[PDB]
Amino acid sequence: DETGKELVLVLYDYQEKSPREVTIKKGDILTLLNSTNKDWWKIEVNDRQGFVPAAYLKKLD
Structure with missing residues (x-):
């Protein structure tokens, strides 16, 4: 974690x-x-x- 292992692709900008x-x-x-x-x-x-919407990220696996 904390930079390594599970990665995610940001689907949309999020403020x-x-x-x-x-x-x-x-x-x-x-x-x-x-x-x-x-x-x-x-x-x-x-x-x-920190947190962001789960729907705004795709899990890379």
């Missing part, structure tokens, strides 16, 4: 809305840190970790 969210760019390949919640997954982008 953070809550203090626990992060902003992601469409077309980015990022580390999937936690996919236990159906609607909200934690990922890493740059030097940040």
Whole structure:
């Protein structure tokens, strides 16, 4: 994790809305840190970790 193993493809741009969210760019390949919640997954982008919509990411496997 925390940069390595499970990766995800960002399907659409996403602008953070809550203090626990992060902003992601469409077309980015990022580390999937936690996919236990159906609607909200934690990922890493740059030097940040936070949630974004699960539907806005595709799991790469």
